[PDB]
Amino acid sequence: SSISDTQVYIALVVALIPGLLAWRLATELYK
Amino acid sequence: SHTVKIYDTCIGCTQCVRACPTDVLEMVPWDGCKAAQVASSPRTEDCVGCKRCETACPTDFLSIRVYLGAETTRSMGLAY
Amino acid sequence: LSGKTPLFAGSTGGLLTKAVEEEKYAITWTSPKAQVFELPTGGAATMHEGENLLYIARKEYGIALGGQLRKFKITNYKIYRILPSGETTFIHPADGVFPEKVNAGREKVRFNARSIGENPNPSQVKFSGKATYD
Amino acid sequence: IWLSGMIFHGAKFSNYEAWLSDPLNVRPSAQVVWPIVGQDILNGDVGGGFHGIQITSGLFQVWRGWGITNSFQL
Amino acid sequence: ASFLSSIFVPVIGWVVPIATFSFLFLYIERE
Amino acid sequence: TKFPKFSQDLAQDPTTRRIWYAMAMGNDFESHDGMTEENLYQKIFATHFGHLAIIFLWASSLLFHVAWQGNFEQWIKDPLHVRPIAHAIWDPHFGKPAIEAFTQAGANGPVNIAYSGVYHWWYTIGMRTNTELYTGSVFLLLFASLFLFAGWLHLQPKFRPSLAWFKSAESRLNHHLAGLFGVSSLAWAGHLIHVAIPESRGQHVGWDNFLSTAPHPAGLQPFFTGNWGVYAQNPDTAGHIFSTSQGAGTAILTFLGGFHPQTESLWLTDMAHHHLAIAVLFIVAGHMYRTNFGIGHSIKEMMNAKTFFGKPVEGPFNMPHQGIYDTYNNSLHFQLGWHLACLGVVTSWVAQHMYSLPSYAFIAKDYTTQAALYTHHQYIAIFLMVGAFAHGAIFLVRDYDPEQNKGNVLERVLQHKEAIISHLSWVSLFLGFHTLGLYVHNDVVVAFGTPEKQILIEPVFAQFIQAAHGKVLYGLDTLLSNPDSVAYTAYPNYANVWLPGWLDAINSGTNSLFLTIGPGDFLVHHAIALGLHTTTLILVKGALDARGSKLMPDKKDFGYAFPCDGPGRGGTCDISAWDSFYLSLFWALNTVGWVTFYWHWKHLGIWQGNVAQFNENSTYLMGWFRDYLWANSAQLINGYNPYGVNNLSVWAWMFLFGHLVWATGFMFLISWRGYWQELIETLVWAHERTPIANLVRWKDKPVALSIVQARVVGLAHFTVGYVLTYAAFLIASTAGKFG
Amino acid sequence: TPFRRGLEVGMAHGYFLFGPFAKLGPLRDAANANLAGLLGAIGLVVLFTLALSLYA
Amino acid sequence: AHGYFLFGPFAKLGPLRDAANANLAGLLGAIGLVVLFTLALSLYANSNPPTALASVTVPNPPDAFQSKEGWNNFASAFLIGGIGGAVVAYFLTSNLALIQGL
Ligand code: CLA
Ligand code: CLA
Ligand code: CLA
Ligand code: CLA
Ligand code: CLA
Ligand code: CLA
Ligand code: CLA
Ligand SMILES: CC1=C(/C=C/C(C)=C\C=C\C(C)=C\C=C\C=C(C)\C=C\C=C(C)\C=C\C2=C(C)C(=O)CCC2(C)C)C(C)(C)CCC1
Ligand SMILES: CC1=C(/C=C/C(C)=C/C=C/C(C)=C/C=C/C=C(C)/C=C/C=C(C)/C=C/C2=C(C)CCCC2(C)C)C(C)(C)CCC1
Ligand SMILES: CC1=C(C/C=C(\C)CCC[C@H](C)CCC[C@H](C)CCCC(C)C)C(=O)c2ccccc2C1=O
């Protein structure tokens, strides 16, 4: 009926990896 | 700020200076044998950019243009 | 800088906070008679017989007033620029001769010897830091 | 000319004389469009045996307030 | 894990606008 | 104040103008202060990676919510009668009646039905579980992270590409065609054969077992051998139930060419056969060019060619293309204006097919997704098409060098542009005087109770196109409807295997494949003609007249987007080429409006089994006013009546919302600046002369919006209202009736 | 700081002035006896703060 | 003065006004509004605010709001007094029946 609870936290933790890189790409483009 | 550039098609009608609200344009002596008067734009910092100088020019196309640029308090007509 | 104020009750249209902080302006004129003249920002005011002085927020108010003064046959109008530190600069008739009339001492500025059709294209001048109107 | 034109239409092309007989069942009309292409429909059964466009200016009520009861008077 | 919606929705509506508009207003007004 | 960091002119601005204009030109790297050509290309290249990441993160969202908050596994068991879920609602503002209304589709909470059609995509693709969607979501996050790192990397000093690497055009075509188009097309045939087609037949194929289990019973030996006919031996029978083995076959590649009976969609076996052939041509197409090995075609040599076999021709087709290569490659706006138009056409090309040739299973019966998808892509086609001329106009201003061109085709257009703009005006005038007055003649004459007197004329030669495809309804008996014709039975090779399946579909009448066209269909295409010619007229004029005009010969010196040249010489309200763009969207939005109204009302008649109401009433414009707008808006306006609330409550709120956004724009269009600046000057007086609020004072002086800015703000309001309030009508009218 | 001094001074007096109004004031034998002391004590603090700012 | 003012609209007119926790919603809602009001002062203070103006009714220079320090100290006191005014208005209105019941 839905994804398990544990899988949701994993994808949420995985989302930090684009976030740290999006911040790095963005600040680099400003420079 | 707003650049006012004058070209060689001037004929010394002086109609541009009389239309300036802020006294940006000033006639000056043309050393050559064209006339005793050709326009100038010394106090360009006060150019608000109302294009009254262009409407008063009698040439085919203008002897004087007003290329807009950066804005300032004097140009935006702000009394505050 | 000296003169008398035109006699009027006052008006909201007039000087604002900018005058204290930056570049208020002034205009001076002398008339033999004492007529009624419309002010630059609304209202009407009388004028004394000697050395009238008015403070204005911008340069446009003065020349707009000076044009009205020429209707009353008054041609001696001087405009100043008063900075917050008290520095005053005589501006509008920068020489004794008016702008519309020619004076020998003046020099041409921002004059292009060519016609407008002869100006270069923008593609010919890009990333150089120069504009087509030069 | 306008005001005189309104009352003139009430005289010649109208149902005002019939409207006074029954002001609650007959609707007021004074305009008649000719039997030319498809526009005779606008002259429907407005009432009182008259085929005309229904009017909303209220001139019929004014003439009754003026005590006008026949066409020749208008 | 439906409780995450109760925590992540208002962060988008309140915390993110406040933090972003706060920094930007100071950044645009800097000298 | 140093906020912009790209224009010192904006920073040295005491007013509020700096904040707005900064938002405007932040992506305009060409206008940024001190931007060299190398840094320009390098910055553009890294930005693409951040853009690609936003796409994949957005795609990851569709899979996560549909897996976590969706009914995918439930919808699969009964796709036609089960409604798909997009995501779950959580709004503290809701009341108990609203939650009870939005609790639909068998969910345990307030939920939003879906209309994107991804459920029909993910069923046809080979996905059958929520967990399979979760893997795709997580995969795209890392796939996006891969690009975000690449963008940061290519800005580092020793990894920064050089200018010549960007201008290596002949190589880039070589890799994109062969690799990006071809291999990606070749790979897709792999998934269809290894995953999708088996999953449609019942077998579960995944990463655990795709190496072990084979798609076809015979191995890959027939391919390497060459007896390729084996793969098309046993096709799926007509009585094949999707995602099961009943009536299934073993064929992975075939050319059945018709529609699947159950799903009323195209055969997956053809889609696998489809992409494989295209990848072969794309790979073959890729090897044309002159890349460093030396074996290939040089586009610059072909452009500068002046000699045929023996004849000294002026060029290709004896037309001088002497300086088109450097023109295309050196200027980016020329590329962007070109690529956008190519993409804008393809976007409409998608929409024109997806309703007539549905590829995804059971999407034809989901009448709402078929409408929102059509209206979606066509609107996108407009901006991509309208944006193309805007960049083509920018090219003629800041990148076009007449000395380098010097007599080529492009300069030859500018020489006779008056004939181009003039004749377009005649076509636009010739259409609308006649297209309108026929509507008005029929509308009046029907209003006078004489519909027989209408001017109804049949789309004859368009029906010949449908009869050319095998439609027997008209009875023309032309090519491919005549069984004896040479096209029906190819004389040399009797291999028209597409024929038995295609004729069954087009002659069915149920599907939307080449539906019947009547006199109502005639006039609307000419209305569409008027929109597309006139949008072109506006855009073509501004581009060609961007460099100069008799009113303003020095337009190139001022730039693309300048407000005006003052009131002199008669008035110069809208002279900039930006203004030609500005007036075009008002049309281009209307053109798809004329299209989408035509698509929607024609389909509502078919879905409801009432074709007569369109064929009869579409002639007079009151029919579009009455039968389509008035009647279909009934359920929407009753979304929240005083007798309760139903599912269609967002749409009514969105309906009135877009109405308000559409209108508040008109202020910025009708009312112009000088009125508002004087009004703001009074507010400045009061705030500076009020007792207690005198403590607080603006840092940046408040001023009215600029002339060009209000045009920008006004049109977005015109568009956002235009887009939203029709989406609410399109979805609510279709969803409430469900066709 | 001057603010810290008055807080230490006020916290003492506020805590002191509750007693006389509660036990010995009116309605001392009732369920709301302690509540009347809280209002009367805060009343003097307002009057006392008035005299402070007034003397200031 | 403002915490005492802002408690009323949330309580007697906000949602749950016709409920047991009506007065409590006014206190929490007002404090959240006071915090935003406090945050606004810190931004206007930490952005180098220009000056305070002198009008006819206040002829002298108004006060020492001519710096970041004057506005920042103003902000810290707004939260302290602001929350206090709301808490006062809550206890009175909630216990107004008792105070009259005395
Ligand atoms: C997008 C995010 C978002 C979210 C999550 C909310 C959430 C909420 N809004 Mg809201 N709002 C938003 C955007 C949002 N809003 C926007 C953009 C607007 C502009 C139109 C509004 C306009 C708006 C109005 C006009 C009102 C709300 C109200 C409410 C609350 C109604 C709850 C309820 O059932 O009744 C109330 C149920 C209760 C149990 C009482 C609520 C108690 C509050 C929420 C406690 C808050 C504590 C506070 C944060 C303390 C911080 C202190 C700390 C910083 C030191 C709820 C908290 C209503 C309200 O009165 O809330 C108080 C209300 O009148 N909102
Ligand atoms: C007072 C009116 C009001 C308010 C304040 C809300 C508030 C909300 N509704 Mg809502 N709603 C309302 C009336 C209202 N509703 C009515 C009358 C209906 C019809 C019955 C609905 C039906 C409804 C549904 C069906 C759903 C909501 C949802 C939501 C929530 C969306 C939150 C979110 O994703 O972030 C904010 C959302 C954004 C899209 C961001 C703003 C978008 C702007 C335009 C672009 C962003 C860029 C910006 C311009 C740049 C500056 C910002 C900077 C930070 C970069 C939010 C709590 C959704 C929900 O439950 O939450 C998930 C949802 O599914 N509402
Ligand atoms: C896809 C490729 C693409 C690329 C790379 C560009 C890139 C560029 N374009 Mg371009 N353009 C495109 C597509 C593209 N555009 C399309 C499809 C169109 C047709 C509409 C245009 C139309 C266009 C015009 C008319 C102009 C440009 C300009 C520019 C340049 C400056 C951009 C700018 O000002 O910042 C971007 C600034 C913005 C303010 C963008 C965001 C504004 C949107 C519309 C706000 C919408 C409101 C809100 C989000 C909706 C809320 C929803 C509601 C329900 C709540 C830049 C080089 C300008 C220029 O001078 O070129 C040199 C210029 O004059 N383009
Ligand atoms: C002429 C006006 C006037 C009025 C209306 C009152 C009224 C009152 N006096 Mg009083 N008094 C006055 C003049 C006045 N006095 C003068 C001139 C003197 C000097 C001789 C006194 C000396 C005096 C003494 C010595 C006492 C009173 C007490 C009382 C209260 C007793 C009521 C009762 O029956 O038991 C009590 C009934 C109740 C319902 C409880 C009352 C609770 C108090 C009054 C609540 C006050 C809150 C207050 C407004 C907070 C102030 C802050 C605000 C300014 C912001 C009553 C409120 C008695 C008392 O203890 O009151 C507490 C008491 O002991 N008075
Ligand atoms: C095989 C080698 C190869 C490959 C795979 C790519 C791939 C790519 N390059 Mg690239 N490049 C290469 C060699 C290659 N290049 C070489 C050798 C050079 C130097 C000459 C460059 C120089 C270069 C530059 C300078 C830039 C790129 C860019 C790009 C990206 C384009 C945007 C995109 O994703 O389009 C995706 C396109 C497709 C998938 C196909 C075409 C689109 C059609 C319409 C879709 C197919 C139709 C179908 C029905 C769609 C259905 C959808 C489905 C969901 C239903 C893309 C990732 C650009 C970029 O984004 O920056 C990172 C960019 O700026 N490249
Ligand atoms: C319903 C509104 C409407 C209508 C009817 C038009 C009509 C027209 N626009 Mg247009 N326009 C509109 C809205 C509209 N626009 C809006 C909102 C914008 C955004 C600003 C624009 C922006 C715009 C631009 C930018 C351009 C046009 C152009 C045109 C013309 C294109 C030629 C054509 O199609 O021939 C068909 C013409 C018609 C159907 C109108 C003819 C008039 C009637 C049918 C006959 C007249 C007889 C009359 C009834 C009797 C006299 C009675 C007595 C009282 C005097 C045409 C006149 C283009 C143009 O002129 O180039 C040629 C052009 O460049 N318009
Ligand atoms: C502009 C008109 C307007 C008005 C008067 C109201 C009024 C109200 N709304 Mg509402 N609302 C509006 C527009 C309006 N709305 C719009 C446009 C939307 C769509 C976004 C909503 C969406 C909305 C929601 C979603 C909710 C409300 C709610 C409410 C109620 C609670 C108000 C509240 O807590 O605020 C608190 C207000 C303040 C803290 C500030 C009050 C300011 C005071 C009155 C200033 C007085 C100045 C004074 C007289 C001058 C001093 C002079 C000096 C010299 C002495 C109230 C009935 C809530 C409800 O449940 O309704 C019953 C709720 O949940 N509203
Ligand atoms: C090497 C090699 C060979 C071996 C090949 C073998 C043994 C395996 C090949 C594996 C490959 C190359 C697999 C391709 C992997 C990429 C995949 C699987 C995913 C692409 C997904 C994309 C792009 C995004 C999809 C989306 C997501 C994620 C969704 O969830 C919904 C759909 C959509 C939104 C589209 C052979 C022997 C041949 C020759 C010798 C060399
Ligand atoms: C007649 C008149 C008028 C009116 C007035 C009014 C209406 C008033 C207002 C009112 C108000 C507006 C009030 C308010 C008040 C408030 C208060 C009373 C406060 C309180 C406070 C407190 C007491 C607090 C304390 C605290 C703190 C601070 C901290 C801790 C806690 C506590 C609680 C302890 C006017 C002027 C307009 C005009 C003229 C005439
Ligand atoms: C109202 C109006 C103004 C005055 C409008 C002003 C000063 C804008 C005031 C709006 C304020 C800034 C609030 C707007 C907030 C928006 C909802 C969000 C904008 C922020 C984005 C950057 C996200 C003009 O200056 C103008 C100029 C030319 C033609 C027409 C008009 C015109 O109609």
Curated annotation (Swiss-Prot), chain C:
Cellular component terms (Gene Ontology): photosystem I reaction center; plasma membrane-derived thylakoid membrane
Localisation per UniProt entry: Cellular thylakoid membrane
Recorded topology in the membrane: Peripheral membrane protein
Swiss-Prot/TrEMBL GO biological process terms: photosynthesis
Pfam families per record: PsaD
Keywords, sorted A to Z: Membrane, Photosynthesis, Photosystem I, Thylakoid
Keyword Methyltransferase in record: no
Top-rank lineage group of the source organism: Bacteria
InterPro entries in UniProt: PsaD, PsaD_sf
Protein family according to the UniProt entry: Belongs to the PsaD family.
Role summary: PsaD can form complexes with ferredoxin and ferredoxin-oxidoreductase in photosystem I (PS I) reaction center.
PANTHER family: PHOTOSYSTEM I REACTION CENTER SUBUNIT II, CHLOROPLASTIC (PTHR31982:SF5), PHOTOSYSTEM I REACTION CENTER SUBUNIT II-1, CHLOROPLASTIC-RELATED (PTHR31982)
Binding partners and assembly: The cyanobacterial PSI reaction center is composed of one copy each of PsaA,B,C,D,E,F,I,J,K,L,M and X, and forms dimeric and tetrameric complexes.
Protein name, entry field: Photosystem I reaction center subunit II
Swiss-Prot record, chain E:
GO CC terms, sorted: photosystem I; plasma membrane-derived thylakoid membrane
Lineage, opening ranks: Bacteria, Bacillati, Cyanobacteriota, Cyanophyceae, Nostocales
Quaternary organization: The cyanobacterial PSI reaction center is composed of one copy each of PsaA,B,C,D,E,F,I,J,K,L,M and X, and forms dimeric and tetrameric complexes.
Alphabetical UniProt keywords: Membrane, Photosynthesis, Photosystem I, Thylakoid, Transmembrane, Transmembrane helix
Top-level taxon of origin: Bacteria
Gene name tied to this protein: psaI
Topology class, membrane: Single-pass membrane protein
Function (record text): May help in the organization of the PsaL subunit.
Protein name per its UniProtKB record: Photosystem I reaction center subunit VIII
Keyword Hydrolase assigned: no
Keyword Coiled coil applies: no
Family classification: Belongs to the PsaI family.
Compartments, as annotated in UniProt: Cellular thylakoid membrane
GO biological process: photosynthesis
Segments passing through the bilayer: 8-28
Species of provenance: Nostoc sp. (strain PCC 7120 / SAG 25.82 / UTEX 2576)
Swiss-Prot record, chain F:
Record's keyword terms, sorted: 4Fe-4S, Chlorophyll, Chromophore, Electron transport, Iron, Iron-sulfur, Magnesium, Membrane, Metal-binding, Oxidoreductase, Photosynthesis, Photosystem I, Thylakoid, Transmembrane, Transmembrane helix, Transport
PROSITE patterns found in the cross-reference section: PHOTOSYSTEM_I_PSAAB
GO molecular function: 4 iron, 4 sulfur cluster binding; chlorophyll binding; electron transfer activity; magnesium ion binding; oxidoreductase activity
Record keyword Iron-sulfur present: yes
Principal place of residence: membrane
Any one GO CC term of the record: photosystem I
GO BP terms, alphabetized: photosynthesis
Positions of chlorophyll a B3 binding: M667, Y675
Amino acids binding [4Fe-4S] cluster: C564, C573
Membrane topology field: Multi-pass membrane protein
Residues engaged in binding chlorophyll a B1: H659
Entry superkingdom: Bacteria
Subunit organization: The PsaA/B heterodimer binds the P700 chlorophyll special pair and subsequent electron acceptors. PSI consists of a core antenna complex that captures photons, and an electron transfer chain that converts photonic excitation into a charge separation. The cyanobacterial PSI reaction center is composed of one copy each of PsaA,B,C,D,E,F,I,J,K,L,M and X, and forms trimeric complexes.
Name of the featured protein: Photosystem I P700 chlorophyll a apoprotein A2 1
Protein's organism: Nostoc sp. (strain PCC 7120 / SAG 25.82 / UTEX 2576)
Gene: psaB1
Swiss-Prot record, chain G:
The record's account of how the chain is modified after translation: Two stable N-terminal degradation products have been sequenced at the protein level.
Membrane spanning residue stretches: 35-55
Compartments, as annotated in UniProt: Cellular thylakoid membrane
Family, similarity comment: Belongs to the PsaL family.
SUBUNIT field: The cyanobacterial PSI reaction center is composed of one copy each of PsaA,B,C,D,E,F,I,J,K,L,M and X, and forms dimeric and tetrameric complexes.
Listed name of the protein: Photosystem I reaction center subunit XI
Annotated source species: Nostoc sp. (strain PCC 7120 / SAG 25.82 / UTEX 2576)
Underlying gene: psaL
Parent-protein start and end of this portion: 58 to 113 of 172
